[PDB]
Amino acid sequence: APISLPAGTYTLKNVSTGTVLDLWRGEAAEGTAIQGYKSHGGDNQKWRLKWTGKGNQVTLQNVKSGTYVGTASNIQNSVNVVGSTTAVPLDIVAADKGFAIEAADHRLFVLDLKESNPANETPVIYYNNNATDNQKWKFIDE
Amino acid sequence: APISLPAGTYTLKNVSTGTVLDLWRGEAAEGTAIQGYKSHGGDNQKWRLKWTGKGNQVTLQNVKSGTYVGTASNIQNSVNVVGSTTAVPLDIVAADKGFAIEAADHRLFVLDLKESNPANETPVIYYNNNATDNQKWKFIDEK
Structure with a gap:
C-alpha cells in the first residue's frame, strides 16, 4: 500500500515509554510545558x-491551545520544548x-523524552539525535 | 493504527510524473544509471x-541487482544517481x-527526477532540495 x-x-506516542506528547492542561500561555503523559484522549494531547x-x-500545533511546538530558549541539548505562538519549524524523519x-x-537536535522516563509530566527536551527510542515518536492519525 | x-x-513513485525509480536493465555494474520509468512491476523497479x-x-537496495542507490561522483547538483556497491546513506523526510x-x-541534496520529465529514461540526479514535486516520492510498500 502507498x-x-x-x-x-x-497523537504522538513516544516509542520508549508509550506515553504521549502533552501540553500542560492545554494552556495557551507562552512557555507552557510540553511533556510525556499517559494517553487520555484530551485535545491537549493532539x-x-x-x-x-x-x-x-x-509545524505542530496543539489542538487545545492553538499554540505550537516551540522552545524555552535557544535550541540546545536539554532545552525544554514548550508551547509558543512562535513555532519552531521541524522535519519529520522516518526512523526504524x-x-x-x-x-x-538545528538538525542535530530532536524532540527527546528525558531519560526515557514513562512517569507523567516527564519533560520533553531538545537533544542530540542518537536515534535512541525516547527520540522516536509514533504518529497516530485522527 | 499508527x-x-x-x-x-x-515501489518509489515520483509525485510529479507518476513514473517510478528504475535501475537501468537491473544491472549490477558499478555506475549503472538510476532513472524514471513507467511502472511495469519488474524487480529492477523494487x-x-x-x-x-x-x-x-x-539505504535503498535494488531487488534485481543487489546494488544500492549511490552516486557517480562527489555529490553536487546534477550528479547522477546510480547503482553502486557503495550505498549513499539517506534520510527519508515527510513531504507535503x-x-x-x-x-x-549531504543534506541539502535530494533524489530528483530531472526537470519533472515523465519520459522513460529521464535521469535521477542529486539536486538542491527545493521541495518541488519531482523531488518527492510515494513510498508504495509491497506486502
Missing part, C-alpha cells in the same frame, strides 16, 4: 501537522521505529 | 529500505506529498 503521512491531527511551504518543513522530529534549522 | 514506514520492499544502525539513516529522499551526509 504509505503517506498526511497533514492532519495526531497535534496538527502542517507543512509551512519552506522545503519539507512543518516511528519518526524522529528534528529541529529544521 | 502510520509507519517499515523496512521492506517498495527497492529494499533498511536502517543502517547509524541515527535514522537508511510523499517523502523526500535526502543524502544523509
Whole structure:
C-alpha cells in the first residue's frame, strides 16, 4: 500500500515509554510545558501537522491551545520544548521505529523524552539525535 | 493504527510524473544509471529500505541487482544517481506529498527526477532540495 503521512491531527506516542506528547492542561500561555503523559484522549494531547511551504518543513500545533511546538530558549541539548505562538519549524524523519522530529534549522537536535522516563509530566527536551527510542515518536492519525 | 514506514520492499513513485525509480536493465555494474520509468512491476523497479544502525539513516537496495542507490561522483547538483556497491546513506523526510529522499551526509541534496520529465529514461540526479514535486516520492510498500 502507498504509505503517506498526511497533514492532519495526531497523537504522538513516544516509542520508549508509550506515553504521549502533552501540553500542560492545554494552556495557551507562552512557555507552557510540553511533556510525556499517559494517553487520555484530551485535545491537549493532539497535534496538527502542517507543512509551512519552506522545503519539507512543518509545524505542530496543539489542538487545545492553538499554540505550537516551540522552545524555552535557544535550541540546545536539554532545552525544554514548550508551547509558543512562535513555532519552531521541524522535519519529520522516518526512523526504524516511528519518526524522529528534528529541529529544521538545528538538525542535530530532536524532540527527546528525558531519560526515557514513562512517569507523567516527564519533560520533553531538545537533544542530540542518537536515534535512541525516547527520540522516536509514533504518529497516530485522527 | 499508527502510520509507519517499515523496512521492506517498495515501489518509489515520483509525485510529479507518476513514473517510478528504475535501475537501468537491473544491472549490477558499478555506475549503472538510476532513472524514471513507467511502472511495469519488474524487480529492477523494487527497492529494499533498511536502517543502517547509524541515527535514522537508511539505504535503498535494488531487488534485481543487489546494488544500492549511490552516486557517480562527489555529490553536487546534477550528479547522477546510480547503482553502486557503495550505498549513499539517506534520510527519508515527510513531504507535503510523499517523502523526500535526502543524502544523509549531504543534506541539502535530494533524489530528483530531472526537470519533472515523465519520459522513460529521464535521469535521477542529486539536486538542491527545493521541495518541488519531482523531488518527492510515494513510498508504495509491497506486502
